[PDB]
Protein backbone atom coordinates (compact mmCIF):
# COMPACT_ATOMS: atom_id res chain seq x y z
CA UNK A 1 0.00 0.00 0.00
CA UNK A 2 1.99 3.00 1.33
CA UNK A 3 0.18 6.24 0.79
CA UNK A 4 1.98 9.39 -0.34
CA UNK A 5 0.96 12.65 1.33
CA UNK A 6 2.03 15.93 -0.09
CA UNK A 7 2.11 19.22 1.71
CA UNK A 8 1.15 21.91 1.48
CA UNK A 9 -1.79 21.37 -0.87
CA UNK A 10 -1.21 25.00 -2.11
CA UNK A 11 2.08 26.83 -1.88
CA UNK A 12 2.36 30.64 -2.48
CA UNK A 13 5.71 32.11 -3.60
CA UNK A 14 6.87 35.43 -5.11
CA UNK A 15 9.31 35.27 -7.98
CA UNK A 16 12.72 35.32 -6.39
CA UNK A 17 11.74 33.36 -3.30
CA UNK A 18 13.12 29.93 -2.38
CA UNK A 19 10.45 27.27 -1.77
CA UNK A 20 10.33 23.59 -0.74
CA UNK A 21 7.42 21.17 -0.71
CA UNK A 22 7.28 17.76 0.96
CA UNK A 23 6.13 14.23 0.16
CA UNK A 24 5.54 11.98 3.16
CA UNK A 25 5.33 8.18 2.82
CA UNK A 26 3.20 6.25 5.28
CA UNK A 27 6.00 3.66 5.24
CA UNK A 28 9.62 3.79 4.14
CA UNK A 29 10.29 3.79 0.39
CA UNK A 30 13.60 3.66 -1.44
CA UNK A 31 13.02 6.44 -4.01
CA UNK A 32 10.47 9.17 -4.66
CA UNK A 33 10.05 10.55 -8.17
CA UNK A 34 8.55 13.98 -8.95
CA UNK A 35 6.47 15.28 -11.86
CA UNK A 36 5.40 18.78 -12.94
CA UNK A 37 1.93 19.14 -14.52
CA UNK A 38 0.53 22.32 -16.04
CA UNK A 39 -3.28 22.32 -16.60
CA UNK A 40 -4.26 21.04 -20.04
CA UNK A 41 -1.00 19.15 -20.38
CA UNK A 42 0.28 15.80 -19.20
CA UNK A 43 2.65 15.30 -16.25
CA UNK A 44 6.36 15.60 -17.09
CA UNK A 45 9.21 13.83 -15.28
CA UNK A 46 10.84 16.56 -13.13
CA UNK A 47 13.06 14.83 -10.48
CA UNK A 48 13.79 11.09 -10.53
CA UNK A 49 15.28 8.67 -8.01
CA UNK A 50 14.93 11.32 -5.32
CA UNK A 51 17.46 13.88 -6.53
CA UNK A 52 18.33 13.57 -10.20
CA UNK A 53 17.11 16.34 -12.52
CA UNK A 54 15.20 15.06 -15.56
CA UNK A 55 16.60 16.28 -18.94
CA UNK A 56 15.76 19.93 -19.62
CA UNK A 57 14.77 20.71 -16.02
CA UNK A 58 16.14 24.02 -14.63
CA UNK A 59 19.07 23.69 -12.22
CA UNK A 60 17.13 25.87 -9.73
CA UNK A 61 15.18 22.67 -8.93
CA UNK A 62 16.55 19.98 -6.63
CA UNK A 63 15.17 17.04 -4.69
CA UNK A 64 16.13 15.19 -1.50
CA UNK A 65 15.03 12.94 1.30
CA UNK A 66 15.03 9.36 2.65
CA UNK A 67 12.86 6.77 4.34
CA UNK A 68 9.52 8.46 4.69
CA UNK A 69 10.40 12.10 4.05
CA UNK A 70 11.17 13.68 0.72
CA UNK A 71 11.07 17.21 -0.65
CA UNK A 72 11.44 19.18 -3.84
CA UNK A 73 13.04 22.65 -3.70
CA UNK A 74 13.11 25.61 -6.13
CA UNK A 75 16.03 27.86 -5.29
CA UNK A 76 14.63 30.93 -7.03
CA UNK A 77 10.96 30.71 -8.09
CA UNK A 78 10.07 32.04 -11.56
CA UNK A 79 6.55 32.76 -12.83
CA UNK A 80 6.65 29.79 -15.24
CA UNK A 81 7.02 27.52 -12.19
CA UNK A 82 3.26 27.83 -11.59
CA UNK A 83 2.04 24.19 -11.82
CA UNK A 84 1.04 21.19 -9.72
CA UNK A 85 3.95 18.95 -8.61
CA UNK A 86 3.27 15.25 -7.90
CA UNK A 87 5.47 12.73 -6.06
CA UNK A 88 5.45 8.98 -6.81
CA UNK A 89 6.79 5.67 -5.44
CA UNK A 90 6.87 2.10 -6.91
CA UNK A 91 7.46 -0.01 -3.78
CA UNK A 92 4.71 -2.60 -4.09
CA UNK A 93 1.74 -2.92 -6.47
CA UNK A 94 0.34 -0.60 -7.30
CA UNK A 95 2.78 2.31 -7.68
CA UNK A 96 0.96 5.37 -6.21
CA UNK A 97 1.04 9.16 -6.62
CA UNK A 98 0.59 11.81 -3.92
CA UNK A 99 -2.30 14.33 -4.19
CA UNK A 100 -0.03 17.11 -5.44
CA UNK A 101 1.19 20.53 -4.41
CA UNK A 102 -0.05 23.49 -6.49
CA UNK A 103 2.53 26.29 -6.71
CA UNK A 104 0.71 29.60 -6.89
CA UNK A 105 2.75 32.60 -8.02
CA UNK A 106 2.22 35.68 -5.86
CA UNK A 107 1.81 38.92 -7.84
CA UNK A 108 0.37 42.46 -7.23
CA UNK A 109 -3.40 43.00 -7.16
CA UNK A 110 -4.99 43.59 -10.60
CA UNK A 111 -8.55 44.61 -11.19
CA UNK A 112 -10.50 42.64 -13.78
CA UNK A 113 -11.14 43.95 -17.28
CA UNK A 114 -14.95 43.43 -17.34
CA UNK A 115 -16.93 43.05 -20.63
CA UNK A 116 -20.69 42.57 -20.86
CA UNK A 117 -22.52 41.10 -23.90
CA UNK A 118 -26.23 41.02 -24.62
CA UNK A 119 -27.63 37.79 -26.16
CA UNK A 120 -26.57 37.24 -29.78
CA UNK A 121 -29.45 37.77 -32.26
CA UNK A 122 -28.78 34.31 -33.62
CA UNK A 123 -29.25 32.76 -30.16
CA UNK A 124 -32.21 35.04 -29.42
CA UNK A 125 -34.14 34.02 -32.57
CA UNK A 126 -33.72 30.45 -31.31
CA UNK A 127 -35.76 31.35 -28.20
CA UNK A 128 -32.84 31.70 -25.78
CA UNK A 129 -31.04 34.58 -24.11
CA UNK A 130 -27.59 34.15 -22.51
CA UNK A 131 -26.02 37.31 -21.13
CA UNK A 132 -22.23 36.86 -20.96
CA UNK A 133 -19.74 38.73 -18.82
CA UNK A 134 -15.97 38.34 -19.04
CA UNK A 135 -13.85 39.37 -15.98
CA UNK A 136 -10.32 39.01 -17.27
CA UNK A 137 -6.71 39.23 -16.08
CA UNK A 138 -7.22 39.84 -12.35
CA UNK A 139 -5.47 38.87 -9.09
CA UNK A 140 -6.05 37.49 -6.54
CA UNK A 141 -8.15 34.56 -7.69
CA UNK A 142 -10.94 35.21 -5.16
CA UNK A 143 -13.72 37.34 -6.68
CA UNK A 144 -17.48 37.66 -6.49
CA UNK A 145 -19.85 38.34 -9.37
CA UNK A 146 -23.42 39.46 -8.85
CA UNK A 147 -26.06 39.80 -11.49
CA UNK A 148 -28.68 42.49 -11.29
CA UNK A 149 -31.64 42.90 -13.58
CA UNK A 150 -33.10 46.39 -12.99
CA UNK A 151 -31.54 46.85 -9.54
CA UNK A 152 -32.85 43.44 -8.49
CA UNK A 153 -30.08 40.89 -7.90
CA UNK A 154 -30.72 37.30 -8.95
CA UNK A 155 -28.52 34.24 -8.55
CA UNK A 156 -30.43 31.45 -10.35
CA UNK A 157 -29.36 30.91 -13.96
CA UNK A 158 -25.72 31.99 -13.40
CA UNK A 159 -22.97 29.61 -14.57
CA UNK A 160 -19.40 30.51 -13.72
CA UNK A 161 -16.05 29.28 -14.95
CA UNK A 162 -12.52 30.30 -14.00
CA UNK A 163 -9.23 29.77 -15.72
CA UNK A 164 -5.99 28.61 -14.12
CA UNK A 165 -3.17 31.00 -13.36
CA UNK A 166 -1.55 32.51 -16.44
CA UNK A 167 2.07 31.47 -16.99
CA UNK A 168 3.34 34.90 -18.13
CA UNK A 169 1.37 37.49 -16.15
CA UNK A 170 0.20 35.24 -13.37
CA UNK A 171 -3.38 36.42 -13.54
CA UNK A 172 -6.74 34.65 -13.47
CA UNK A 173 -9.84 35.05 -15.67
CA UNK A 174 -13.50 34.23 -15.27
CA UNK A 175 -16.66 34.12 -17.35
CA UNK A 176 -20.05 34.45 -15.88
CA UNK A 177 -23.28 33.67 -17.78
CA UNK A 178 -26.87 34.50 -16.98
CA UNK A 179 -29.18 32.17 -18.86
CA UNK A 180 -32.81 33.00 -19.55
CA UNK A 181 -35.30 32.44 -22.36
CA UNK A 182 -35.90 35.14 -24.97
CA UNK A 183 -39.13 36.00 -23.20
CA UNK A 184 -37.67 36.49 -19.74
CA UNK A 185 -34.94 38.63 -21.20
CA UNK A 186 -37.69 40.86 -22.55
CA UNK A 187 -39.43 41.68 -19.26
CA UNK A 188 -36.52 43.74 -17.99
CA UNK A 189 -34.49 46.73 -19.16
CA UNK A 190 -31.17 46.95 -17.30
CA UNK A 191 -28.67 44.06 -17.06
CA UNK A 192 -25.66 44.46 -14.75
CA UNK A 193 -22.65 42.23 -14.11
CA UNK A 194 -21.18 43.36 -10.75
CA UNK A 195 -17.74 42.35 -9.54
CA UNK A 196 -16.61 42.58 -5.91
CA UNK A 197 -12.84 42.07 -5.64
CA UNK A 198 -9.94 42.83 -3.25
CA UNK A 199 -8.74 45.59 -5.62
CA UNK A 200 -11.50 47.88 -4.28
CA UNK A 201 -14.40 48.22 -1.85
CA UNK A 202 -16.83 49.44 -4.49
CA UNK A 203 -17.78 46.86 -7.13
CA UNK A 204 -17.03 47.13 -10.83
CA UNK A 205 -20.34 47.40 -12.67
CA UNK A 206 -20.91 46.79 -16.33
CA UNK A 207 -24.37 47.15 -17.74
CA UNK A 208 -26.39 47.64 -20.86
CA UNK A 209 -30.05 48.27 -21.48
CA UNK A 210 -31.94 45.83 -23.62
CA UNK A 211 -32.24 47.63 -26.98
CA UNK A 212 -34.75 45.86 -29.25
CA UNK A 213 -33.19 45.97 -32.70
Amino acid sequence: QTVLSQSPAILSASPGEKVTMTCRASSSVTYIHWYQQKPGSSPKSWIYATSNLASGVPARFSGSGSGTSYSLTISRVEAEDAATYYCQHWSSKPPTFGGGTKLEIKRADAAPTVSIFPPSSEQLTSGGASVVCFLNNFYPKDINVKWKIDGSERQNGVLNSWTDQDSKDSTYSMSSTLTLTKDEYERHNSYTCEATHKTSTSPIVKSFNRNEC
Partner: protein, 222 residues
Protein backbone atom coordinates in the same frame (compact mmCIF):
# COMPACT_ATOMS: atom_id res chain seq x y z
CA UNK B 1 13.31 12.35 -29.27
CA UNK B 2 11.05 9.85 -27.46
CA UNK B 3 7.42 10.46 -28.33
CA UNK B 4 4.13 8.86 -27.40
CA UNK B 5 0.93 9.95 -29.26
CA UNK B 6 -2.41 8.64 -28.14
CA UNK B 7 -5.67 8.25 -30.09
CA UNK B 8 -9.01 6.71 -29.34
CA UNK B 9 -10.69 8.66 -26.61
CA UNK B 10 -14.37 9.54 -26.73
CA UNK B 11 -17.81 8.79 -25.40
CA UNK B 12 -18.94 5.18 -24.79
CA UNK B 13 -21.98 3.98 -22.93
CA UNK B 14 -21.75 1.99 -19.67
CA UNK B 15 -21.12 -1.68 -20.44
CA UNK B 16 -19.34 -0.76 -23.61
CA UNK B 17 -15.81 -1.54 -24.64
CA UNK B 18 -13.26 0.83 -26.22
CA UNK B 19 -9.61 0.43 -27.14
CA UNK B 20 -7.09 3.29 -26.82
CA UNK B 21 -3.83 3.47 -28.76
CA UNK B 22 -0.47 5.03 -28.18
CA UNK B 23 1.92 5.39 -31.13
CA UNK B 24 5.51 5.37 -29.99
CA UNK B 25 8.72 6.43 -31.67
CA UNK B 26 12.26 7.37 -30.72
CA UNK B 27 13.28 4.27 -28.76
CA UNK B 28 13.03 0.43 -29.08
CA UNK B 29 9.44 -0.15 -28.09
CA UNK B 30 10.11 -3.77 -27.13
CA UNK B 31 12.88 -3.08 -24.62
CA UNK B 32 10.66 -1.05 -22.25
CA UNK B 33 7.93 -1.55 -19.76
CA UNK B 34 4.88 0.30 -21.10
CA UNK B 35 2.23 1.69 -18.87
CA UNK B 36 -1.16 3.37 -18.81
CA UNK B 37 -2.08 5.83 -16.04
CA UNK B 38 -5.44 7.72 -15.87
CA UNK B 39 -6.31 11.07 -14.26
CA UNK B 40 -9.98 11.29 -13.36
CA UNK B 41 -11.54 14.76 -12.74
CA UNK B 42 -10.19 16.09 -9.45
CA UNK B 43 -8.58 12.82 -8.50
CA UNK B 44 -5.00 11.66 -8.19
CA UNK B 45 -3.11 9.98 -10.99
CA UNK B 46 -3.98 6.20 -11.02
CA UNK B 47 -1.70 3.58 -12.63
CA UNK B 48 -3.67 0.86 -14.40
CA UNK B 49 -1.16 -1.69 -15.62
CA UNK B 50 1.79 -2.49 -17.83
CA UNK B 51 3.24 -4.85 -20.40
CA UNK B 52 6.89 -5.76 -20.09
CA UNK B 53 9.79 -5.93 -22.46
CA UNK B 54 11.21 -8.80 -24.54
CA UNK B 55 13.80 -9.98 -22.07
CA UNK B 56 11.11 -10.38 -19.43
CA UNK B 57 8.78 -12.27 -21.77
CA UNK B 58 6.32 -9.41 -22.36
CA UNK B 59 4.41 -9.99 -19.09
CA UNK B 60 1.47 -7.86 -18.03
CA UNK B 61 0.46 -6.57 -14.63
CA UNK B 62 -2.79 -4.69 -13.79
CA UNK B 63 -4.05 -2.79 -10.78
CA UNK B 64 -6.85 -4.37 -8.68
CA UNK B 65 -9.64 -2.09 -10.00
CA UNK B 66 -9.02 -2.60 -13.73
CA UNK B 67 -7.77 -6.17 -13.26
CA UNK B 68 -9.87 -8.29 -15.61
CA UNK B 69 -11.57 -5.44 -17.36
CA UNK B 70 -8.56 -3.88 -19.00
CA UNK B 71 -5.91 -5.56 -21.21
CA UNK B 72 -2.67 -4.11 -22.47
CA UNK B 73 -0.89 -5.36 -25.60
CA UNK B 74 1.51 -4.35 -28.33
CA UNK B 75 0.61 -4.24 -32.00
CA UNK B 76 2.05 -6.94 -34.24
CA UNK B 77 3.67 -4.59 -36.78
CA UNK B 78 3.19 -1.00 -35.79
CA UNK B 79 4.97 0.37 -32.68
CA UNK B 80 1.52 0.81 -31.10
CA UNK B 81 0.58 0.20 -27.49
CA UNK B 82 -3.05 -0.60 -26.73
CA UNK B 83 -5.38 -0.45 -23.75
CA UNK B 84 -8.49 -2.58 -24.32
CA UNK B 85 -11.18 -1.68 -21.87
CA UNK B 86 -14.35 -3.64 -21.36
CA UNK B 87 -17.53 -3.27 -19.31
CA UNK B 88 -16.77 0.42 -18.83
CA UNK B 89 -18.57 2.44 -16.20
CA UNK B 90 -18.98 6.14 -15.26
CA UNK B 91 -16.09 6.04 -12.72
CA UNK B 92 -13.73 5.19 -15.60
CA UNK B 93 -14.23 8.70 -17.19
CA UNK B 94 -10.81 10.30 -17.24
CA UNK B 95 -7.81 11.48 -19.15
CA UNK B 96 -5.69 8.44 -20.08
CA UNK B 97 -1.92 8.51 -20.52
CA UNK B 98 0.41 5.94 -21.95
CA UNK B 99 3.75 6.19 -20.22
CA UNK B 100 7.18 4.58 -20.47
CA UNK B 101 8.95 3.30 -17.34
CA UNK B 102 12.65 3.99 -17.60
CA UNK B 103 13.40 0.53 -16.10
CA UNK B 104 11.69 -2.16 -14.13
CA UNK B 105 9.26 -0.75 -11.53
CA UNK B 106 11.24 2.50 -11.51
CA UNK B 107 9.72 5.78 -12.86
CA UNK B 108 7.74 7.20 -15.82
CA UNK B 109 10.22 9.21 -17.89
CA UNK B 110 7.99 9.98 -20.91
CA UNK B 111 4.28 10.53 -21.12
CA UNK B 112 1.77 10.78 -23.94
CA UNK B 113 -0.28 13.96 -24.45
CA UNK B 114 -3.34 12.23 -23.03
CA UNK B 115 -6.70 11.22 -24.56
CA UNK B 116 -10.09 11.49 -22.84
CA UNK B 117 -12.74 8.87 -22.22
CA UNK B 118 -16.26 9.74 -21.14
CA UNK B 119 -18.51 6.90 -20.07
CA UNK B 120 -22.12 8.00 -20.23
CA UNK B 121 -25.50 7.22 -21.72
CA UNK B 122 -26.18 10.93 -22.66
CA UNK B 123 -26.29 11.66 -26.37
CA UNK B 124 -23.72 13.21 -28.70
CA UNK B 125 -24.95 16.73 -29.54
CA UNK B 126 -23.20 19.39 -31.64
CA UNK B 127 -22.59 22.82 -30.06
CA UNK B 128 -24.52 25.93 -30.94
CA UNK B 129 -21.90 28.67 -31.52
CA UNK B 130 -22.87 32.34 -31.14
CA UNK B 131 -20.73 35.44 -31.79
CA UNK B 132 -20.29 38.01 -28.97
CA UNK B 133 -19.93 41.67 -29.97
CA UNK B 134 -20.88 44.66 -27.78
CA UNK B 135 -24.29 46.24 -28.41
CA UNK B 136 -22.84 49.78 -28.57
CA UNK B 137 -19.90 51.99 -29.59
CA UNK B 138 -17.84 50.87 -26.64
CA UNK B 139 -14.49 52.46 -27.50
CA UNK B 140 -13.47 55.08 -24.91
CA UNK B 141 -10.49 53.37 -23.24
CA UNK B 142 -8.81 51.41 -26.06
CA UNK B 143 -8.46 47.58 -26.67
CA UNK B 144 -11.59 45.55 -27.54
CA UNK B 145 -12.86 42.25 -26.12
CA UNK B 146 -14.93 39.91 -28.29
CA UNK B 147 -16.15 36.35 -27.76
CA UNK B 148 -18.07 33.21 -28.78
CA UNK B 149 -20.49 31.12 -26.77
CA UNK B 150 -20.22 27.37 -27.61
CA UNK B 151 -23.42 26.04 -26.10
CA UNK B 152 -25.33 22.75 -25.69
CA UNK B 153 -22.83 20.12 -26.84
CA UNK B 154 -21.83 16.60 -25.60
CA UNK B 155 -19.39 15.15 -25.12
CA UNK B 156 -16.19 17.01 -24.44
CA UNK B 157 -14.13 18.40 -26.00
CA UNK B 158 -14.33 21.14 -28.60
CA UNK B 159 -11.34 23.10 -29.84
CA UNK B 160 -11.52 26.91 -30.32
CA UNK B 161 -9.03 29.04 -32.23
CA UNK B 162 -9.20 32.67 -33.34
CA UNK B 163 -8.41 33.50 -36.90
CA UNK B 164 -7.08 29.97 -37.31
CA UNK B 165 -4.75 30.49 -34.40
CA UNK B 166 -3.32 33.63 -36.02
CA UNK B 167 -4.73 35.39 -32.99
CA UNK B 168 -2.78 33.75 -30.16
CA UNK B 169 -2.52 36.65 -27.67
CA UNK B 170 -5.43 37.90 -25.65
CA UNK B 171 -7.38 34.62 -25.76
CA UNK B 172 -9.13 33.07 -22.77
CA UNK B 173 -10.99 29.91 -23.54
CA UNK B 174 -12.87 28.94 -20.45
CA UNK B 175 -13.38 25.40 -19.04
CA UNK B 176 -16.76 24.02 -20.13
CA UNK B 177 -19.57 23.76 -17.55
CA UNK B 178 -21.85 20.73 -17.62
CA UNK B 179 -25.52 20.98 -16.86
CA UNK B 180 -28.10 18.23 -17.33
CA UNK B 181 -26.14 16.23 -19.91
CA UNK B 182 -24.95 19.26 -21.83
CA UNK B 183 -21.75 21.32 -21.97
CA UNK B 184 -21.29 25.04 -22.59
CA UNK B 185 -18.09 27.02 -22.77
CA UNK B 186 -17.06 30.47 -23.93
CA UNK B 187 -13.94 32.04 -25.27
CA UNK B 188 -12.81 35.65 -25.33
CA UNK B 189 -10.25 37.34 -27.51
CA UNK B 190 -8.89 40.84 -26.84
CA UNK B 191 -7.67 42.63 -29.91
CA UNK B 192 -6.41 46.11 -30.74
CA UNK B 193 -9.08 48.46 -32.16
CA UNK B 194 -7.21 48.93 -35.47
CA UNK B 195 -7.77 45.20 -36.39
CA UNK B 196 -11.50 45.12 -35.74
CA UNK B 197 -14.01 45.32 -37.40
CA UNK B 198 -11.52 46.50 -39.96
CA UNK B 199 -9.83 43.11 -40.26
CA UNK B 200 -12.21 40.19 -39.57
CA UNK B 201 -12.14 38.29 -36.28
CA UNK B 202 -13.48 34.75 -36.45
CA UNK B 203 -13.71 31.93 -33.92
CA UNK B 204 -13.13 28.45 -35.34
CA UNK B 205 -14.98 25.82 -33.30
CA UNK B 206 -14.54 22.06 -33.79
CA UNK B 207 -16.49 19.31 -32.03
CA UNK B 208 -14.99 16.04 -33.43
CA UNK B 209 -17.62 13.80 -31.85
CA UNK B 210 -20.12 15.36 -34.26
CA UNK B 211 -17.61 16.29 -36.99
CA UNK B 212 -18.90 19.86 -36.54
CA UNK B 213 -16.53 22.62 -37.53
CA UNK B 214 -17.89 26.21 -37.54
CA UNK B 215 -16.38 29.62 -37.96
CA UNK B 216 -18.41 32.50 -36.54
CA UNK B 217 -17.13 35.89 -37.74
CA UNK B 218 -17.69 38.54 -35.08
CA UNK B 219 -19.76 41.23 -36.78
CA UNK B 220 -20.34 44.64 -35.15
CA UNK B 221 -23.90 45.38 -34.05
CA UNK B 222 -25.67 48.25 -32.17
Amino acid sequence: EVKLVESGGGLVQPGGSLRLSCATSGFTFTDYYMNWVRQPPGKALEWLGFIGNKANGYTTEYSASVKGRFTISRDKSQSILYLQMNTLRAEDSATYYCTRDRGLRFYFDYWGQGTTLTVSSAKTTPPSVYPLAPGSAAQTNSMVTLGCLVKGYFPEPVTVTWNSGSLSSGVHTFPAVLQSDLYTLSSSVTVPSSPRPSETVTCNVAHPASSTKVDKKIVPRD
